[PDB]
Design a binder for this molecule. Structure first.
Ligand SMILES: *[C@H]1O[C@H](CO)[C@@H](O)[C@H](O)[C@H]1NC(C)=O
Ligand SMILES: *[C@H]1O[C@H](CO)[C@@H](O)[C@H](O)[C@H]1NC(C)=O
Ligand SMILES: [Cl-]
Ligand SMILES: [Cl-]
Ligand SMILES: [Cl-]
Ligand SMILES: [Cl-]
Ligand SMILES: [Cl-]
Ligand code: NA
Ligand SMILES: [Zn+2]
Ligand SMILES: [Zn+2]
Ligand SMILES: [Zn+2]
Ligand SMILES: [Zn+2]
Ligand SMILES: [Zn+2]
Length: 358
């Protein structure tokens, strides 16, 4: 009877997820370790309540992994999660929501992994797109949000060694606090890559709009986290906003949760398989006598590499999904987001030959 407690935390999600009450210890998809899954649906959605709720839970019950989803647009959630994964040397998966928005810096000791694309993959795709439509002259505009440095580099890198005639005209760096205007006015290019948070973005646009740089002639392309919840669209978001997004259509929540439990339950089974051990439950986020810093690294070798049934879920070093299915989307005229492209693996399939006008 090899068990492993898993917490499924669902902050703000509509309760459409139903987990087997674990009476009959029937095994999960024929894996050696039975996951004892504890469901939890927090109502309050502020980070404070989450840190409290997750932590309390970890001392009360015997948890050796956390699958965590939220329907909020708070990248904040990611900090609290990386922190906990670190303090407790426990794997925590950022399955969806703010909890999975690119966290650039990340405690290299933590086991916080996020679903969806890395800052790099996303950059590599935004260029992948600009080619399909021979959009070669462009400016970058980032804020100070962690990642900006890593993002700009990925662009500059792929540019340098490319036969294609890329012209990176400007790169801005916005000290938010409206001195932005004097900066954003200096923009010439037609294509603009804007790297920042959703909330930062809405200010940045409100400004550009009353400077014209947002309209016809200018198309803005933007990372997955600025789209955020596609159901919430700022007034200031320009129609004709291109964005990369994780795929919330063919990939429902319950499928991720399944995948979450799978990732962990596999790693655990493959460790019990190679060493008669599964790391005891750590029971404090704070009071840390759990200097068990070694059995961690071992687990971490198995989590990082799961492939389950059809899907491949192996993770990158910086804790992003290595092979995510992406969707390019477009802020239309009626102000919804349309699907207008897919990305499989280095394979960018678009829907239109003539790029639409909104
Ligand atoms: C959630 O439900 C409880 C139960 O009565 C309520 O008192 C609380 O304020 C609610 N919070 C939100 C954001 O709806
Ligand atoms: C993950 O990496 C290891 C290390 O050699 C490899 O042997 C393993 O089979 C990989 N995952 C899969 C599904 O092959
Ligand atoms: Cl929110
Ligand atoms: Cl993201
Ligand atoms: Cl950075
Ligand atoms: Cl299942
Ligand atoms: Cl499509
Ligand atoms: Na993500
Ligand atoms: Zn199955
Ligand atoms: Zn092409
Ligand atoms: Zn979703
Ligand atoms: Zn051993
Ligand atoms: Zn791939």
């Amino acid at each position: 009877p090899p068990s492993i407690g898993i917490a499924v935390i669902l902050v703000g999600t509509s309760d459409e997820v139903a987990i087997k009450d674990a009476h009959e210890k029937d095994d999960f998809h024929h894996l050696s370790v039975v996951p004892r899954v504890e469901l939890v649906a927090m109502n309050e959605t502020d980070p404070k309540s989450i840190i409290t709720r997750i932590c309390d839970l970890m001392s009360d019950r015997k948890i050796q992994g956390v699958v965590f989803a939220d329907d909020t647009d708070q990248e904040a959630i990611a900090q609290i999660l990386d922190f906990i994964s670190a303090q407790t040397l426990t794997p925590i998966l950022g399955i969806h929501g703010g909890s999975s928005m690119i966290m650039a810096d990340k405690d290299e000791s933590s086991m916080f992994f996020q679903f969806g694309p890395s800052i790099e993959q996303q950059a590599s795709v935004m260029l992948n797109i600009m080619e399909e439509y021979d959009w070669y002259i462009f400016s970058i505009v980032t804020t100070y949000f962690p990642g900006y440095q890593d993002f700009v580099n990925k662009i500059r890198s792929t540019i340098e060694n490319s036969f294609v005639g890329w012209e990176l005209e400007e790169v801005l760096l916005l000290d938010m606090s409206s001195k932005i205007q004097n900066q954003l006015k200096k923009l010439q290019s037609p294509i603009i890559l804007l790297y920042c948070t959703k909330e930062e973005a809405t200010y940045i646009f409100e400004v550009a709009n009353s400077v014209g740089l947002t309209g016809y002639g200018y198309t803005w392309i933007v990372p997955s986290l600025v789209a955020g919840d596609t159901d919430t669209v700022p007034s200031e978001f320009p129609t004709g906003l291109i964005s990369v997004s994780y795929d919330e259509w063919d990939y429902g929540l319950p499928a991720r949760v399944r995948d979450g439990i799978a990732i962990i339950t596999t790693a655990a089974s493959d460790m019990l398989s190679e060493h008669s051990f599964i790391p005891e439950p750590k029971s404090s986020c704070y009071n840390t006598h759990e200097k068990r810093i070694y059995q961690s690294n071992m687990l971490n070798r198995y989590l990082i590499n799961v492939t389950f049934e059809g899907r491949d879920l192996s993770f990158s070093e910086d804790g992003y999904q290595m092979h995510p299915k992406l969707v390019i989307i477009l802020l239309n005229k009626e102000r919804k987001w349309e699907r207008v492209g897919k990305w499989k693996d280095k394979s960018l399939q678009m829907k239109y030959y003539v790029w639409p006008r909104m």
